C-alpha cells in the first residue's frame, strides 16, 4: 500500500485543496514509519521511505513559496481575486495555527463589506430607476452626487462616499414616491366613479409637489386610462 | 435532459412519502475561479414513472447546493447556495424563491446544508460554513434568526467547518454532530444546561478533510465516518475515542456514501 | 432494461379503456404522452449506447476506426422494435 499511496500521489498529482493533499497523505505515512520501527528489506523500504517523504515535503515547501508570491501580488493590484485570497488566508491561516498589515486591510475590507453591501444596494437602486420620471430627472439635480461619485469612481473618502450612497438612498426613496405616485395614477353611480376618479388626480396633483406641461400629460394619460376602462 | 450539461450534481436527495418515486436533485461546481460563464442553475425534480422533462424547476438567485427537501410531505422544498442565502419553494409555482431567507449580519459564507429540526407543527432549519458559525433559523413564519450562536471551539479558532449533520433516531432531542472538515468530527447539544460553551466532542483521528457521517439506523447509535479514503465506523462513548470496525485502506480518495 | 423493459411495456399498454364515449377521447389524450414519453428514452438509449462504444481507451483501436453501417444497422433494428410495439398495441385494442 506504498506503492497504493505512490501510485494515486504521482498519477493526480480553493488553492490550498494541494497543501491539504501532501499533508493529509504526509501525516496520513507517519504513522507507519512510526508503527514498524517500534534488518533486510527495512533497508529498501527506508529507500522508497525517504526520497518519497522527503521530496513531498519539497513540494509542500515550494507551494508556500509561490503562493505567498501569489497572495503578495493579488494584494499589490487589489489596493474572483478578492474571495480567492480572503479564503486563500483564511486557510493556510487555519493551518499555520495547527502579513500583519495584509491581515489589518483584510479587517478593513470585512468592515468595509459592510458598506460593500451597501454598494449593492446602490447599484440596484441605479438598476431599478421612467416617461413618468422624466419631469423629475428632468427638473432633478442628481448629476452633482454622481459626479461627486464619478470622481469618486477614479481613506475616510470611502467612508464620506458610504453617506454620499445614504443621501443618495433618500434620492431612490424620492424615485420610489414618484413609482408609487404612477401607480396610483394608474389605478347615479356616475357620481361615484365620477368622485373616484377626482380623488385620484387630486391625490397624484397634491403628491406631485415643463413640469406643469408633463403633469398635465400624465393627467390626459389618465383620462385616456379612464375612457378605455370606462367604456367597457 | 440535455440541459443537464457543464453541471455537477453535487447532491440528489430523495422524496419522502412512500410511493411517489420523485427525486429531487441539486447540480452545482464549486472551485468557482471556473464558475461557469454560462448557465445560472436551476435544480430539477424528476420521476420514475416516466423519466419526464423535470415536473417543476427550481431557479435561485445563485449557485444551489444541498437542497435538502421538507419533511414527509408533497408541499415545499429546501434549498442551499452560495452566499448564505436559504431558500424555500412549493409546488404550485415553477418559479424562483417562494420566502428568500434573506442576508443578515453573519452568515455570509456558503452552505453545505438545511438540515431540519423536529420543530413539531411547523418546520425549522440550520446551517454550517467555513466560517463556523452555525446559524438556527424560523419556523413557518421566516426572516429571523431564532438561536444565532456563532458557535466557538474552546480554545478559540472558531473557523470550524461542517458537512453533512447527523441527528437522533430516538425521539430527537437535539443531539447531534457536525462533519468537521479539518479532520476532527465534532458534536454538540444545543439545550446548555453548562454555560453556552457545550461543544463536547473532537474525535480527532480521522483523516484530512471529511466528507462522511451518519448515525447508524434500524436498531442502535453507533455513527459512520466514510469521509476520508478509510471508510471507518466509530462509536459514541467518551472511553472509545477511536474506531471499532476500520476498514480498507483504500486508492482514489473517498467522498461519500451512508 | 432501458431499451427492452420500455418495449416491451409500450406493446403492453391499452389505449382504449371502459356521447359519453368522448371521455375515451380524453383517455387517448393521456396515454399518448405516455408512449411519447418512453419513445423518446428510447430515443435517447440507443443514442447513448453509441456513445458508450466509442468514447473508450483501447490502444489496438487508434489506428483502426469504428466502421458505420453496421451502427446504422443497430440503429435499423431499434427502429423495427418500435414499430413490432405499436403494430402488437394496435391489434390487441382491436381485439
Known sequence: DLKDVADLFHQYKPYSGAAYWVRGLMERIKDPMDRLLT???????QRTYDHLWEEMTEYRTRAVDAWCAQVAATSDE????????????????????????????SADTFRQQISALDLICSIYNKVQRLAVEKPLVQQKLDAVEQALNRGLAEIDTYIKECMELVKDVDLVLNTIKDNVKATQGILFDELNDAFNQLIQQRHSEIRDAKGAASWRAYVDYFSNIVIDGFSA | DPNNIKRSASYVNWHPDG??????????????????????????????NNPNTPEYEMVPTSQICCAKFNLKDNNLVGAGQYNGQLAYFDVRKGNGPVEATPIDISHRDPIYDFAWLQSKTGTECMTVSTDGNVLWWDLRKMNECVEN??????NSETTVGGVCLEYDTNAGPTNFMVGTEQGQIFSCNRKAKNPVDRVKYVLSGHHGPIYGLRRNPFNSKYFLSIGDWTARVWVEDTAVKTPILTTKYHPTYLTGGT | NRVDSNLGAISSTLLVELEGFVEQNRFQKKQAELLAIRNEEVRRAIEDLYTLVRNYPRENTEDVLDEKEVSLLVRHYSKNMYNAIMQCTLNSLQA
Not at chain 2, 427525486?23 to 424528476?46: D, N, T
Open chain 1, 39 to 45: 534488518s533486510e528489506l527495512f533497508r529498501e523500504i
Open chain 1, 78 to 105: 487589489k489596493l474572483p481575486a478578492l474571495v480567492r485570497l480572503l479564503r486563500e488566508t483564511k486557510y493556510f491561516l487555519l493551518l499555520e495555527t495547527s502579513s500583519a498589515k495584509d491581515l489589518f486591510a
Open chain 2, 19 to 48: 410511493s411517489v418515486p420523485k427525486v429531487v436533485v441539486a447540480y452545482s461546481i464549486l472551485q468557482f475561479q471556473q464558475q461557469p460563464a454560462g448557465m445560472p442553475l436551476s435544480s430539477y425534480i424528476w420521476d420514475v
Open chain 2, 149 to 154: 450562536m456563532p458557535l466557538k471551539e474552546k
